[PDB]
Amino acid sequence: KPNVAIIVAALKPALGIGYKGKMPWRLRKEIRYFKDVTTRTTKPNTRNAVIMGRKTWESIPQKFRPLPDRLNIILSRSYENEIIDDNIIHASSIESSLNLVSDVERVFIIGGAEIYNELINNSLVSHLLITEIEHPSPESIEMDTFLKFPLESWTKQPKSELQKFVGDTVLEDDIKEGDFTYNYTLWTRK
Ligand SMILES: NC(=O)C1=CN([C@@H]2O[C@H](COP(=O)(O)OP(=O)(O)OC[C@H]3O[C@@H](n4cnc5c(N)ncnc54)[C@H](OP(=O)(O)O)[C@@H]3O)[C@@H](O)[C@H]2O)C=CC1
Ligand SMILES: CCc1nc(N)nc(N)c1C#CCc1cc(OC)ccc1OC
């Protein structure tokens, strides 16, 4: 089996993630956390996979595309299940994409909304890496895109389990970037 996790940054308490196809924030440490965790492998001869919707792919800046050091899987309902090049796979589903290569250690679902809100209730996903973002006045930030997670069916793990998961990665508490404050968290199924 492949270890499949969801990684996302969301604003509490509504868990908003975007506005008009855009990200409502630019968090410099968070971006860097995202990179290190999705890239890091333990075993040699392995890579990690990043799975995403077509729209999230289209929104990734030209030069960061495909996301380096990781296998990129792009999801569309139009896609045949084929390898485009060494770094890029097109797929109809996660299940179809997993049966396409075997060099993968960890699989990370990286967005967007339609992808998250569907794969949250898929049994393959065993971990959630949610960056919980806070703001003194959350409603002042314009938001039309939200997570629909039944978090009552999941367990927020201790920091020690997250540290285990992300290896040596530095996990700072209450990161203050402008008016935003955030923490990295780990969730497992009940
Ligand atoms: N804060 C965060 O950590 C993140 C936030 N975001 C935000 O999310 C938003 C984007 O989300 P969203 O608009 O939903 O776009 P998505 O990235 O989720 O892409 C949607 C597309 O994915 C394809 N798709 C959806 N479900 C499936 C499925 N079950 N099987 C195969 N393909 C599927 C469809 O492609 P098709 O139509 O071609 O068939 C659909 O049009 C943006 O606002 C972005 O800023 C994104 C990533 C991270
Ligand atoms: C913002 C980076 C990020 N952090 C967390 N915790 N989860 C995520 N899924 C993401 C993401 C994403 C997609 C994306 C990545 C990117 O390179 C960093 C640039 C743009 C992106 O979508 C607009």
Is residue 88 within 8 Å of 65, Cβ to Cβ?
no
Q: Which residues touch 168 (CB under 8 Å, ≥6 apart)?
A: none
- Determine if ligand 2 sits within 6 Å of the CB of residue 17: no
Distance CA 153, CA 182 (A): 23
Is residue 33 within 8 Å of 39, Cβ to Cβ?
no
Which residue in this structure is represented by tokens 């069916």?
Answer: 153
**Which technique was used to obtain these atomic coordinates?**
X-ray
Q: Which residues touch 27 (CB under 8 Å, ≥6 apart)?
A: 9, 133, 175, 177, 180, 182
User: Which ligand does the CA of 34 lie closest to?
Assistant: 2
Q: What is the C-alpha radius of gyration for the chain, rounded to an integer number of angstroms?
A: 16
Distance CA 40, CA 70 (A): 9
Q: What is the resolution of this structure in A?
A: 2.5
> How many angstroms does the Cα of residue 111 sit away from the middle of ligand 2?
8
**Ligand 2 probe mutation, 4, 23, 114, 133, most atoms within 8 A of CB:** 23
Helix (H, G, I), strand (E, B) or coil at 185: strand
Beta-carbon count within 10 A of 101 CB: 13
Burial of 121 (0-12, 13-18, 19+ CB in 10 A): exposed
> How many angstroms does the Cα of residue 60 sit away from the middle of ligand 2?
8
Distance CA 77, CA 189 (A): 28
| Domain around 115 | 1-190
One DSSP character per residue, 126-158 reads: EEEEEEEEE-SSGGGS---EE----GGGEEE--
Q: How far is the CA of 10 from the CAs of 86, 99, 168, in angstroms? A: 31, 30, 24
Is residue 185 within 8 Å of 129, Cβ to Cβ?
yes
Helix (H, G, I), strand (E, B) or coil at 125: strand
Is residue 188 within 8 Å of 127, Cβ to Cβ?
yes
| Of residues 102, 112, 48, the one with CA closest to residue 75 | 112
Distance CA 12, CA 138 (A): 8
Q: Which residue precedes each gap in the chain (C to N above 2.5 Å)?
A: none
- Determine if ligand 2 sits within 6 Å of the CB of residue 111: yes
Residue 158 corresponds to which tokens in the numbers above?
């201790």
Q: What is the CATH number of the domain that holds 16?
A: 3.40.430.10
Is residue 17 within 8 Å of 112, Cβ to Cβ?
yes
- Determine if ligand 2 sits within 6 Å of the CB of residue 72: no
Query: What length is written for the chain?
Result: 190
Is residue 95 within 8 Å of 36, Cβ to Cβ?
no
Q: Number of folded domains in the chain?
A: 1
